[PDB]
Design a protein around this nucleic acid. Structure first.
Ligand SMILES: [Zn+2]
Ligand SMILES: [Zn+2]
Lengths: 116, 48, 46, 434, 372, 360
RNA sequence: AGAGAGGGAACCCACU
């Protein structure tokens, strides 16, 4: 819905898990629109700073991931429509990754950039 | 362009190499005079 | 030092200054006419 | 230009009376550029709606209410090119339209009706751009310009009887080029309305005067019909070049290349048409006692021997004015023009000329002799690197045009459109005929 | 020009509409003031002063605005721009002034006027010749493949769009048409915005006239001269395959300057071309089908007369076939494009300032430089 | 799979175009005019145009209708080729930084103190100011006395100072600037910036030898050059073939008695001849002086160029004697004997003796 | 006694 779309260009941040791009206000008020139940960054700014990225390259307005080859290449076909990031710089701490793995969610990096 | 700078009648080959401006030349109106020889031209002082 | 200009339509004269906008004092007419020179002129009557 | 064909350049037959046959630029633009005749007038055009209403008032059948069987036995009628319908009786319709044009009831005088008689057509043109000329109207082999019209026309400014009143009287009317194809035009009334071995005896219009077929510059030629046509064309080219008083207020105008004459004269041998070009009020030339004689050999091949004493008496001694305009530019502080007397120690790049002729504001006071490469406008533009030493603003001054000399006539100082100071200097140089 | 044509241009421009709540702008009544200069106060600028100071002797042009957003608001006397005035006009300062008054203004009574003062320079609009519009002409392209070609540079008066010449040509090929079946000469028409040689009968069918008898009625007005009917017979027999108005219009839409997509959007383009491109002087309306058919039949009939010689060919240098564009028509032709450009800039400004959700500022919408 | 289509957009407003398209898609996803496109791509560094993912061009045209920022790609669309679709999403990648915006753009700034709030850092800069004298500029030292003399927005705290838009300086600017407003990776200042706050150079025509390997002691002239592993093609003595050598294997060896130049160091700019070639100490004598210059073998190159190493002027006069007596003129040129006089009456300048002239 | 010059392009009217 419109609740996922960022409201302005300032302080745009991409998620470290699903590369969801939202403003800091939307992360503070809604958390993650895909996997907040696995992260629980709603109601905590420090969790957002630890689970979101300040450096991202490229945006994708994924509207219909069920019939998108881009979603196949970016592995976001099973998610919800929204604004996604192509390249994400950052990484979750080991505690969050281990907690996700204990819940059966292995953390695949969204850093698909060609580093030299 | 360079081709347009060379191809014309105002270019380098005709306009500058073939027919060019020259020093030591004067241009003024002619008026008749029957009191000088056929190989004599009466030029003004300010030209000379 | 000031230059006297004739104020166009006004036909009156006034002083002018360097870097002074060109305006008459009577009606602000923009066109000024410089006065005739003070040095002598001599004409051969030919 | 530069076309090898001749049909667009030739003097077509329909150029009679509308455009001068002699005047034209004789360079590579012969016939292309033309000069309008004297009485010729370009119709400014009006709306065709009153004409359509008048046609619908009479028995004209529109295209959307006709059978395609009764079309060929009647005349197709056009307005401004568009076909408006049919009419059964072309006569008494052209008569009615002309009767309204000789009275200015509905149809304007500029509008033209043309009845094609060989092919059943009648076209009415109300366009803006048609070229017409007034002609007399010949009812019977009698002119409609009676003696009473002349009596009321001589006493102008008293009866307020103008040319428009004569147009309203149904005596003269404007005939355009289309209508000239369907008019029988009398040249002069003293010859083409008296009974003889009859030529046509069916005249409709009469030419006012044949001298009105010429232009403005071909009208100042005395006896132009006795000359050869190329000579008339060349005189038409030269007539727009003769020195003279081009305008009455030339002392106010800051014109560039103003050529005026000391003692212009009206021609002793003149035409009637010069009274209407006002050539006797702003003439160009002097009546001279010429002699056509072979002599010492200086009037050999298109040259003339002049009289030195006559020239010393003011014969053709003209005066040539040339204006110089210059303004300063307030810019982004990198270059700043300003009118001032430049100094050798202060200004840089100052050309070697006399700068003491200038006044304190960098301009010449009127009445000062100047010659070639003499400064007339002292203007200096600042240099951005004066700090980036001891050498400051550079000279940007307009000199007097080289190989020219004369006295400065008058100088005007004002502001331009942009509000910057702006000066014009008109320099006067008399030109004795040599 | 400045009394009637400028108002005609303003009124003949459509009221621009923007679709969100819609709003449309309309200009109805124009105002032409006296020449005036200024920063400074409004004062009458005498032409000699404009000549000396290198000014432009131009009079300001106002107009009233009416916008309906509907919520309508009017705006009287909005400054459009300055238009130059030639001297001794009816809107110049020295109109009807006595010679004494002219001499007081340093203007001579001898000056005939008729010239503009632009940046202090006196400009003369030289009258430009042109072929007379809305008039049928029959010429002979003796070098081309056409024996006799007819044309009509049709241009409706007080129409912003320029002229659009339609040609009604007859393929010559005096003998065979380079075939074992093409006997006679076929009449073919060059329509505006259509790149192929469209047959005459195709156009007549496309105008809603299916019968050959009706088309022959509109072309040849006498059925008792078999020679002209025999001459038009090959052109009539070229297009007996196409019999419907739908198929005729489809063939009209084929090979256009803007080609059609399918049967759809190409029927409409052909209808648009036949409605607003060819023959605007006979009318641009839904009921002007038969009037356009009558005039096209006249063009074909005149071409047949030229091919017969019953009427002589037309001369390009006959001065009954020419018009003289004076300052009026020339400035009108200039003002059409520049007024349209001003409308385009206003539309761009409105498009920018409706997508922000706010209301546009109309004084900033009309920029005066594009018109002056 | 759908394909990507290029749509030209307004420059600098591509991300906003993607946001607006997403909002439009969500606003019309339940209506009777749906957006049948699949995704919209606005890359980080691709400026000028965006991408639309769809199976048809008509879908793209009907989806971008009503968007004014894409009106320059509304009539025609260009499809990204099939093999190039992966290049769309392909992304490549007490210190010193260089400021991004302002008048200090790309100027060397010494990172003085890193504020742990991750918002701004203190930077040491050289002011590009005119000290409020021209504006109503190159780098020069901060003159506190000049800015105290000229006045204006200035506050003094000894050597600490605040001036002209809250610019903080001390002794040298010390002002905070954002981390995202500076580049903290890839500055590499020079030695002159150190005072303010390996390498390979092989050239064609130079002579090199081989120091190691099976092709040792083969001297050849350089043909080409590359970055790190050159794979050179040297023209050896008595060998018509071209072999291959990297940079680490070669060395700038020069025979005794040849043109030599120095590329860098203390001896740069000087030329001359070498005398005796040792293991690495190569001694030479200059073309200017006869002083011994000992250089590394790498600091030598083979270049065959020669080493560098009157009062009457403008005075209104009156001819008081001769045929022209009584004429008033202005002296244009003057000599010891004669002087040219611009006559006020005639259109002619004539020369007369100074003894015949009388000034006004 | 302090010593050189620059614009450039475009388009109109004529001149032989
Ligand atoms: Zn997420
Ligand atoms: Zn005054």
């Amino acid at each position: 819905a419109l609740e996922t779309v960022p409201k302005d260009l300032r302080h745009l941040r991409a998620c470290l898990l699903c590369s969801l791009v939202k403003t800091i206000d939307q992360f503070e008020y809604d958390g993650c629109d895909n996997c907040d139940a696995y992260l629980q960054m709603k109601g905590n700014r420090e969790m957002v700073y630890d689970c979101t990225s300040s450096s991202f390259d490229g945006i994708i307005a994924m509207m219909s991931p069920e019939d998108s080859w881009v979603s196949k290449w970016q592995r976001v076909s099973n998610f919800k429509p929204g604004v996604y990031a192509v390249s994400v710089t950052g990484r979750l701490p080991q505690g969050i990754v281990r907690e996700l793995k204990s819940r059966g969610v292995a953390y695949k990096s969204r850093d698909t950039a060609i580093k030299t | 362009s360079l081709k347009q700078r060379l191809k014309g009648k105002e270019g380098r080959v005709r306009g500058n190499l073939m027919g060019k401006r020259v020093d030591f030349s004067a241009r003024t109106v002619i008026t008749p005079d029957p009191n000088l020889s056929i190989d004599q031209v009466g030029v003004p002082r300010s030209i000379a | 030092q000031p230059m006297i200009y004739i104020c166009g339509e006004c036909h009156t004269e006034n002083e002018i200054k360097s870097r002074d906008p060109i305006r008459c004092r009577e009606c602000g007419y923009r066109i000024m006419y410089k006065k005739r020179t003070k040095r002598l002129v001599v004409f051969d009557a030919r | 230009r530069d076309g090898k064909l001749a049909k667009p350049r030739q003097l077509h037959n329909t150029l009679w009376g509308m455009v001068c046959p002699a005047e034209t630029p004789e360079g590579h633009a012969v016939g292309l550029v033309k000069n309008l005749a004297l009485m010729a007038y370009i119709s400014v055009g009006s709306q065709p709606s009153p004409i359509l209403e008048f046609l619908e008032e009479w028995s004209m059948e529109n295209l959307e209410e006709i059978s395609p069987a009764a079309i060929a036995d009647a005349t197709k009628i056009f307005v401004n090119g568009c076909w408006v319908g049919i009419h059964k009786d072309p006569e008494q319709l052209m008569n009615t339209l002309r009767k309204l044009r000789r009275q200015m009831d509905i149809i304007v005088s500029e509008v033209s009706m043309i009845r094609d008689i060989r092919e059943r057509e009648i076209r009415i043109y109300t366009d803006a751009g048609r070229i017409c000329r007034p002609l007399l109207i010949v009812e019977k082999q009698k002119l409609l310009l009676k003696k009473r019209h002349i009596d009321q026309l001589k006493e102008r400014e008293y009866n307020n009887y103008s040319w428009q009143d004569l147009v309203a009287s149904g005596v003269v009317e404007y005939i355009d080029t289309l209508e000239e194809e369907t008019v029988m035009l009398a040249m002069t009334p003293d010859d083409l309305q008296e009974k003889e071995v009859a030529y046509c005896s069916t005249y409709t219009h009469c030419e006012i005067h044949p001298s009105m077929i010429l232009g403005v510059c071909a009208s100042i030629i005395p006896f132009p019909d006795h000359n050869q046509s190329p000579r008339n064309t060349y005189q038409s080219a030269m007539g727009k070049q003769a020195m003279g008083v081009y305008i009455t207020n030339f002392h106010v105008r800051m014109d560039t290349l103003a050529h005026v004459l000391y003692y212009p004269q009206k021609p002793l041998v003149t035409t009637r048409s010069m009274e209407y070009l006002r050539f006797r009020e702003l003439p160009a030339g002097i009546n001279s006692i010429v002699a056509i004689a072979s002599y010492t050999g200086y009037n050999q091949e298109d040259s003339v021997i002049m009289n030195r004493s006559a020239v010393d008496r003011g014969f053709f001694r003209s005066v040539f004015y040339r204006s110089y305009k210059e303004q300063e530019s307030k810019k982004g502080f990198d270059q700043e023009e300003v009118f001032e007397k430049p100094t050798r120690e202060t200004c840089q790049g100052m050309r070697h000329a006399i700068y003491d002729k200038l006044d304190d504001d960098g301009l010449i006071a009127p009445g000062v002799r100047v010659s070639g490469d003499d400064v007339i406008i002292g203007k200096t533009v600042t240099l951005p690197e004066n700090e980036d030493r001891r050498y400051t603003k550079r000279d940007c001054s307009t000199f007097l045009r080289t190989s020219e000399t004369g006295i400065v006539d008058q100088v005007m100082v004002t502001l331009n459109q942009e509000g910057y100071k702006f000066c014009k200097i008109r320099v006067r140089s008399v030109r004795i005929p040599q | 020009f400045i009394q009637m044509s400028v108002q005609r241009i303003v009124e003949d421009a459509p009221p621009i509409d923007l679709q969100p709540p819609r709003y449309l702008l309309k200009f109805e009544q124009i105002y032409l003031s006296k020449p005036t200069h200024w920063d400074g106060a409004p004062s009458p600028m005498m032409p000699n002063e404009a000549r000396l100071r290198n000014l432009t002797y131009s009079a300001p042009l106002y107009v009233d605005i009416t916008k309906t957003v509907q919520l309508q608001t009017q705006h009287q006397k909005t400054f459009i721009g300055k238009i130059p005035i030639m001297l001794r006009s009816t809107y110049c300062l020295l109109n009807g002034l006595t010679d004494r008054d002219l001499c007081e203004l340093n203007e001579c009574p001898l000056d005939p006027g008729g010239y503009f003062i632009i940046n202090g320079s006196e400009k003369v609009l030289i009258a430009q010749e042109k072929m007379a519009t809305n008039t049928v002409y029959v010429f002979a392209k003796k070098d081309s493949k056409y024996a006799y070609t007819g044309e009509c540079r049709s241009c409706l008066e007080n129409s912003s769009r320029p002229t659009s010449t339609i040609w009604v040509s007859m393929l010559a090929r005096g003998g065979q048409g380079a075939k074992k079946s093409a006997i006679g000469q076929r009449i073919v028409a060059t329509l505006p915005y259509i790149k192929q040689e469209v047959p005459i009968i195709i156009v007549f069918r496309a105008l809603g006239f299916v019968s050959d008898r009706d088309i022959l009625e509109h072309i040849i007005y006498d059925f008792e001269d078999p020679e002209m009917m025999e001459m038009v017979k090959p052109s009539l027999d070229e297009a007996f395959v196409i019999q419907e108005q739908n198929v005729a219009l489809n063939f009209i839409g084929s090979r256009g300057a803007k080609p059609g997509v399918t049967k759809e959007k190409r029927i409409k383009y052909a209808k648009e071309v036949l409605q607003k491109e060819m023959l605007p002087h006979v009318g641009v309306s839904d009921f002007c089908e038969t009037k356009k058919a009558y005039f096209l039949g006249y063009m074909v009939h005149r071409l047949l007369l030229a091919a017969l010689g019953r009427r002589e060919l037309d001369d390009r240098d006959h001065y009954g076939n020419k018009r003289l564009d004076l300052a009026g028509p020339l400035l009108a032709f200039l003002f059409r494009g520049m007024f349209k450009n001003l409308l385009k800039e206003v539309r761009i400004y409105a498009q920018k300032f409706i997508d922000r959700g706010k209301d546009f500022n109309l004084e900033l919408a009309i920029k005066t430089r594009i018109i002056s | 799979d759908p394909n990507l289509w290029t749509v030209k957009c307004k420059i600098g407003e591509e991300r906003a175009t993607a946001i607006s398209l997403m909002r439009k898609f969500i606003a019309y996803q339940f209506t009777d005019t749906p957006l049948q496109i699949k995704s919209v791509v606005a890359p980080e560094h691709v400026k000028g145009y965006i991408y639309v993912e769809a199976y048809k061009q008509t879908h793209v045209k009907q989806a971008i209708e009503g968007v004014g920022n894409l009106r320059l790609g509304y009539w025609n669309q260009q499809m990204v080729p099939i093999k190039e679709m992966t290049d769309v999403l392909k992304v490549v990648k007490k210190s010193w930084v260089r400021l991004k915006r302002g008048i200090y753009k790309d100027d060397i700034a010494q990172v003085d103190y890193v504020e742990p709030s991750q918002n701004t850092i203190s930077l040491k800069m050289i002011p590009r100011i005119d000290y409020d004298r021209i504006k109503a500029p190159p780098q020069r030292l901060f003159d506190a006395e000049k800015i105290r003399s000229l006045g204006g927005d200035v506050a003094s705290d000894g050597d600490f100072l605040i001036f002209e838009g809250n610019r903080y300086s001390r002794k040298f600017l010390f002002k905070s600037f954002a981390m995202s407003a500076v580049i903290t990776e890839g500055v590499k200042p020079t030695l002159s910036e150190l005072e303010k706050f390996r390498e390979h150079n092989f050239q064609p025509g130079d002579n090199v030898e081989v120091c190691e390997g099976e092709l040792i002691n083969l001297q050849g002239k350089i043909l080409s050059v590359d970055g790190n592993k050159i794979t050179i093609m040297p023209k050896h003595e008595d060998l018509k073939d071209m072999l291959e050598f990297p940079a680490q294997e070669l060395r700038k060896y020069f025979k005794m008695g040849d043109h030599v130049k120095v590329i860098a160091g203390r001896f740069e700019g000087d030329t001359g001849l070498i005398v005796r070639v040792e293991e690495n100490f190569v001694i030479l004598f200059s073309d200017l002086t006869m002083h011994e210059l000992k250089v590394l073998p790498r600091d030598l190159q083979l270049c065959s160029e020669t080493a560098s190493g009157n009062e009457l002027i403008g005075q209104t006069v009156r001819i008081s004697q001769g045929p022209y007596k009584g004429y008033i003129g202005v002296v244009k040129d003057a000599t010891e004997s004669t002087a040219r006089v611009e006559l006020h009456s005639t259109c002619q300048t004539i020369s007369v003796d100074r003894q015949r002239l009388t000034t006004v």
